[PDB]
Amino acid sequence: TEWKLSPRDIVLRRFGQHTKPPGKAALDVGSMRGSVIPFGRSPGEQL
Amino acid sequence: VFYSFVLVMKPRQRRFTSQALREIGVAVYSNGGLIRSITNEGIMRPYSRFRDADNTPLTYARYIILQLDMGEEEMGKVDKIIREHQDVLMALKLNNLERPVGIRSGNKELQAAYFPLDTFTRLEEEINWSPQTSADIYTQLEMNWKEFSRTRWSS
Amino acid sequence: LAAEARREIHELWLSAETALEREKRVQQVAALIEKYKLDPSTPREADVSRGLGDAFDRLLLLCLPLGKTDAKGTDNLERL
Amino acid sequence: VQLHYHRFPDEQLITNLSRWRTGETVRPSPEVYMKLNYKNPATISRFLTRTGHMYPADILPLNPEAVVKLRVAKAQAIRIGLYPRFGNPFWFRSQKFRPFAYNWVQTDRIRRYFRELEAVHTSG
Amino acid sequence: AHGGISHFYGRTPMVEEVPITLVDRRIMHYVHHSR
Amino acid sequence: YEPWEHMKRMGRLVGTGFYIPPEWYNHFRMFPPINHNFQLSPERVALRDELARKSRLVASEGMRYYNIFWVRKPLDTMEKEYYELKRRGVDHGEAIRKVLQGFYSGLAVKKRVAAIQAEEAKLTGRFITMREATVVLGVLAKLHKEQLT
Amino acid sequence: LEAVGSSVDLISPIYDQFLELCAHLGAVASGFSALKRIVGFGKPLTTRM
Amino acid sequence: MWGEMPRYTSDMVFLYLVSRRRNTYAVAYTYEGKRILN
Amino acid sequence: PGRLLTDFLYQRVPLPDKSCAALIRYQRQQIEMLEVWGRHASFQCAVEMFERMIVTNIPPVEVGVETHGEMVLCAAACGKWEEGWNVYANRARELEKESPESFILNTFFFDALLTLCVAAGRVSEGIDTLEEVIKRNLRPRGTML
Amino acid sequence: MYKKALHSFFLKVHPDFFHHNRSQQTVNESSVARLNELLSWAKAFKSGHLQPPPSSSFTLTFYRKPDTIIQSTFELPSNFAPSDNHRGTVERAVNKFLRDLLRRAACIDSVTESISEAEDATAARAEAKPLRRRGPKSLLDEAVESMTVQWSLTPAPTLQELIEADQILFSRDLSPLQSAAALSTLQRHLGELNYSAWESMPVIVSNQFSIGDLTGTITIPWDFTPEQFHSFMAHNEKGVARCREVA
Amino acid sequence: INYVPHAQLREHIDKELDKYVAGKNEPYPLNFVGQMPFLEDGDGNIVEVPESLLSNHMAEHPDSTAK
Amino acid sequence: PVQKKRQEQMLYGVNIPETRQMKFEEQHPLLAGALRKLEGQPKGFPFWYRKYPTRRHAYEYRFSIPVEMLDGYNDDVKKALSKGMMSIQEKQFAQEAMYMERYAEHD
Known part of the structure; x- marks a missing residue:
């Protein structure tokens, strides 16, 4: 039938597309006081 | 029915009402549409009315039912013409005919459990029953009522 | 007349089960059709077809094996 | 003649048949659902108590489909120009739904009937 | 227009046909229940 | 603060060898505390509704004979005729059509019998029916009360 | 073509030309077997076929 | 317009009683729509 | 584009012929982007914008040959020969004859006319327009040919 | 199991299908009433309360539509008693x-009647050598349930509906007190003995x-005994049937 | 469904408009809402008003001939 | 719900159960069917069902109705079921069905 699409508009994000980026998940890395060892620094905990 | 239209119009003269209806029909036919049924319900007594062409707040109007089978592109033109007509005081469009009203609100199971062909093939009267009509009348239709309705005034 | 046609169809079926000529069975089924007026033009009244029941399908299957090339032997099935 | 004047002349064939339907030894109804539309102010007034505003007490048993259909029917009726914004005209009508004594005037008729019966008996 | 059929004739929520003191008290009780 | 925790604590206290166990410790070892976890025919009805709907309308408007008595007999005979048609042939639409015909024929013949009997009795001037007799008694009683008053 | 979908209807001319090809080639078995396909499609037979 | 809606008469006078939080008003009008009294 | 024109008029800027034609061309891009059964509303928006441009005396707004050609292009994209050839081309020609040399018809206007003729299937009118271009002593375009 | 066979048998032998022969219809009515009583007291025996049978040996006669006379005799064993074994x-x-009645009616099949004989x-x-063990109904259970739900005799009209039926009449030859005596104490508890086939007679x-x-009516003097009425209707049975047929 | 053709447009609208005419008599069919419309003699002339609202109609518009 | 809508849009009678009575028909018998005197005598067995396995094979008429089914019907009904009366959803399905016909591996 017809495809009146424009790659330039798609790449330049005309009409204001939105992607909902990730938040603190990527940024957080935990405490780097020591080295990363298997099972963590305190394997298992009882509350 | 594809579309239904209820027109509340000022009770003008017979010639003027006929001319308005003729213009509506000509527009519908010229826009590649079909009219299932056009009916006049007479002059009634609405609870509240206010004319737009004459700006007279008086309670006297005539009701008309118009059933159409037209596409959206041409139905837009027809709706514009009807709404801009000076005689049409209030036009209400029923487009919820081929699909039952509020099935989605009713239940998720009923959202896709309906067959549009029944409603499309039935007329607007069967879609929205009148107070005087009844399923008793509907069953009398197939009961050979002519041969039975013979002693209806025997007493 | 429906019960009479039913028992007549039963007797015709037993006759066809007995060794009979194909032309003979064609003639018999055609005669039954014409005598009971199993015609599409028959109105709702005196329509033996609507009351035949099992006799209807029995008469339907009674004519097929004897088709041959007879025009009547084909159009009786067409009417049925 | 009749011993008592029942509510309907066909009550004998209506109520007895209705009782017999279930079989005995002696949520909206489909009809009101199909009646429920813009052109039936009586049905919407049945579920609209007093003023045009609806109430959740009837909503609780009623299906959401019925509730939305009632809402759209009321809106369409208002827009087409009936069933006004405030107050339901069929209030006492919906209140029905809650959302061997022989009269002296019949005695004369019976006596005339019996005089005509006497004349008929003499004739035959 | 305040005579005959008025602007509020269609917008009157409660109508009771006829003492009227009991009617007024009942209407006030219904309004209190609503609010 | 649990029966199992109390039992385990008492057991590991006794296991030290320097605590004389109470009797209830061994008794609850024998009987541990109770744990809370680790736990008419539809076709007949439809046919009867169909025949009732086809019969009430013809009796109310078509026939206008509200005084029909013993309506169970025509209804049951019509149902049995429907079954007879269903067994004699396919007879779905034909049986549906014959429903109203048979019911109307039965109603018509019963009404004709009643009408002719009543008319013959009235013309002869004898054989007054029970309803007429009791209506006469009631109106006579009312006239007697009026004469007294 | 049968395995894939289609909207237009050229089944009758297609099978007629196929039967003509079978006539020219001598494939009586293939011509007779195409009748089953025609029946399955529900198309009526033709004097040309 | 019909049914439970009252049917007025030309001789009947419409009295309006408007109570406020700290005031009250009483007015009357004839069927024609004229002020009988302020 | 309607809101764009409204914002320009609210800012009260003197829109010239190039600006009016640019707005109409944006509307035409929207029209040709939209589906076949969704062209009527966009064409009505285009004609409303044209009416606004015509009747807006302040700020100074001029409707020129390029704007008329763009309206003809909108009519061609929608598929309205009767609404395009007998209305907007006629208006442009009337403006040209009324104002000498102030409304000269460029090659763009006749390219729009040929586009409308091709869209509507009109062959005689297209030949006449091309012959007019040839006779007016200006070179045609490759698209026109 | 026997549902289809019993349905066919009741369709063939039900009295409501024979209107041409009123005598055949009433014979079938009496026969099905006797069969219902037989099945009822047999079910009572099965449940555990045992009463003497109304008829230890009796013949039941039915008439069949073309699409003969089906007479089957029920006999009780000689050693019959209210004991649990019996x-x-x-x-x-x-x-x-x-099963003999059904076989004579030809509704049942040879295989299923052989299965019934095998079960018996x-x-x-x-029952001789005691056994032990720790579902489909029987022929008797299928018959009783089919008779109760599908093929039942229509209920006899009550005097209350007979009042509006225009079928109860009384003339001035007798006083209203005599008419009330003839109605109240002779129809309330004495209507059970009256014949069902008589119920259609005004x-x-x-x-x-x-x-x-x-035309088509019968008269009975007031203060009659039920035994006297039974004797009178046994003395005259052809006339009432002929009068009903001619009416 | 009996559709309305292009030709039978005037000949249908006129009949629909004259559906309610006093002279024709006959039991006038009820409207879609199930009530009795004002019977019109012709060219918008109110003649018959329902008895339920006759009093209100007379009070609103005096000197009106209706029944 | 979205998958049900797509399945109904792609296939013919998935919403019809074995009993041939949808839930909506169970709850609203009057709105689902009506009484019609004329019997379905012309309508027999569909001998052309082999060429319409899914809705994408019939995007010429409304509701994906095969052309053969409109034989004993008026030109008015044909025009009412023509392409011009198709809804927006019907036209979008027609486009995607054309593309599926072009690039499909099987029915």
């Missing part, structure tokens, strides 16, 4: 009688023992 064996006896023989073998009360002077 309670068990009377079920087999009535099953044998019912198995029960007879098992009833008049008058001081005469005549078979009726109006």
Whole structure:
């Protein structure tokens, strides 16, 4: 039938597309006081 | 029915009402549409009315039912013409005919459990029953009522 | 007349089960059709077809094996 | 003649048949659902108590489909120009739904009937 | 227009046909229940 | 603060060898505390509704004979005729059509019998029916009360 | 073509030309077997076929 | 317009009683729509 | 584009012929982007914008040959020969004859006319327009040919 | 199991299908009433309360539509008694009688009647040597449920509906007190003995023992005994049927 | 469904408009809402008003001939 | 719900159960069917069902109705079921069905 699409508009994000980026998940890395060892620094905990 | 239209119009003269209806029909036919049924319900007594062409707040109007089978592109033109007509005081469009009203609100199971062909093939009267009509009348239709309705005034 | 046609169809079926000529069975089924007026033009009244029941399908299957090339032997099935 | 004047002349064939339907030894109804539309102010007034505003007490048993259909029917009726914004005209009508004594005037008729019966008996 | 059929004739929520003191008290009780 | 925790604590206290166990410790070892976890025919009805709907309308408007008595007999005979048609042939639409015909024929013949009997009795001037007799008694009683008053 | 979908209807001319090809080639078995396909499609037979 | 809606008469006078939080008003009008009294 | 024109008029800027034609061309891009059964509303928006441009005396707004050609292009994209050839081309020609040399018809206007003729299937009118271009002593375009 | 066979049998032998022969219809009505009583007291025996049978040996006669006369005799065993063993064996006896009636009606199949005979023989073998063990209904249970739900005689009209039926009449020859005596104490508890086939006959009360002077009606004197009415209707049965047919 | 053709447009609208005419008599069919419309003699002339609202109609518009 | 809508849009009678009575028909018998005197005598067995396995094979008429089914019907009904009366959803399905016909591996 017809495809009146424009790659330039798609790449330049005309009409204001939105992607909902990730938040603190990527940024957080935990405490780097020591080295990363298997099972963590305190394997298992009882509350 | 594809579309239904209820027109509340000022009770003008017979010639003027006929001319308005003729213009509506000509527009519908010229826009590649079909009219299932056009009916006049007479002059009634609405609870509240206010004319737009004459700006007279008086309670006297005539009701008309118009059933159409037209596409959206041409139905837009027809709706514009009807709404801009000076005689049409209030036009209400029923487009919820081929699909039952509020099935989605009713239940998720009923959202896709309906067959549009029944409603499309039935007329607007069967879609929205009148107070005087009844399923008793509907069953009398197939009961050979002519041969039975013979002693209806025997007493 | 429906019960009479039913028992007549039963007797015709037993006759066809007995060794009979194909032309003979064609003639018999055609005669039954014409005598009971199993015609599409028959109105709702005196329509033996609507009351035949099992006799209807029995008469339907009674004519097929004897088709041959007879025009009547084909159009009786067409009417049925 | 009749011993008592029942509510309907066909009550004998209506109520007895209705009782017999279930079989005995002696949520909206489909009809009101199909009646429920813009052109039936009586049905919407049945579920609209007093003023045009609806109430959740009837909503609780009623299906959401019925509730939305009632809402759209009321809106369409208002827009087409009936069933006004405030107050339901069929209030006492919906209140029905809650959302061997022989009269002296019949005695004369019976006596005339019996005089005509006497004349008929003499004739035959 | 305040005579005959008025602007509020269609917008009157409660109508009771006829003492009227009991009617007024009942209407006030219904309004209190609503609010 | 649990029966199992109390039992385990008492057991590991006794296991030290320097605590004389109470009797209830061994008794609850024998009987541990109770744990809370680790736990008419539809076709007949439809046919009867169909025949009732086809019969009430013809009796109310078509026939206008509200005084029909013993309506169970025509209804049951019509149902049995429907079954007879269903067994004699396919007879779905034909049986549906014959429903109203048979019911109307039965109603018509019963009404004709009643009408002719009543008319013959009235013309002869004898054989007054029970309803007429009791209506006469009631109106006579009312006239007697009026004469007294 | 049968395995894939289609909207237009050229089944009758297609099978007629196929039967003509079978006539020219001598494939009586293939011509007779195409009748089953025609029946399955529900198309009526033709004097040309 | 019909049914439970009252049917007025030309001789009947419409009295309006408007109570406020700290005031009250009483007015009357004839069927024609004229002020009988302020 | 309607809101764009409204914002320009609210800012009260003197829109010239190039600006009016640019707005109409944006509307035409929207029209040709939209589906076949969704062209009527966009064409009505285009004609409303044209009416606004015509009747807006302040700020100074001029409707020129390029704007008329763009309206003809909108009519061609929608598929309205009767609404395009007998209305907007006629208006442009009337403006040209009324104002000498102030409304000269460029090659763009006749390219729009040929586009409308091709869209509507009109062959005689297209030949006449091309012959007019040839006779007016200006070179045609490759698209026109 | 036997549902289809019983449905066919009741369709063939039901009295409501024979209107041409009123005598055949009433014979079938009496026969089905006797069959219903037989099945009822057999079910009572099965449940555990045992009463003497109304008829230890009797013949049941039915008439069949073309699409002969089906006479089957039910006999009780010689050693019949209210003992539990005879309670068990009377079920087999009535099953044998019912299957014989069905076979004479030709509704049942040879295989299923052989299965019924096998079941009866198995029960007879098992009742001698005690066994142990720790579902489909029987022929008797299928018959009783089919009779109750589908093929039942229409209920007899009550006097209350007979009042509006225009079928109860009384003339001035007798006083209203005599008419009330003829109605109240002779129809409330005495209507059970009256014949079902008689229920279609309009009833008049008058001081005469005549078979009726109006069209299609019969008259009975007031303060009659039920035994006297039974004797009178046994003396005259052809006239009432002929009058009903001609009406 | 009996559709309305292009030709039978005037000949249908006129009949629909004259559906309610006093002279024709006959039991006038009820409207879609199930009530009795004002019977019109022709060219918008109110003649018959329902008896339920006759009093209100007379009070609103005096000197009106209706029944 | 979205998958049900797509399945109904792609296939013919998935919403019809074995009993041939949808839930909506169970709850609203009057709105689902009506009484019609004319019997379905012309409508027999569909001998052309082999060429319409899914809705994408019939995007010429409304509701994906095969052309053969409109034989004993008026030109008015044909025009009412023509392409011009198709809804927006019907036209979008027609486009995607054309593309599926072009690039499909099987029915």
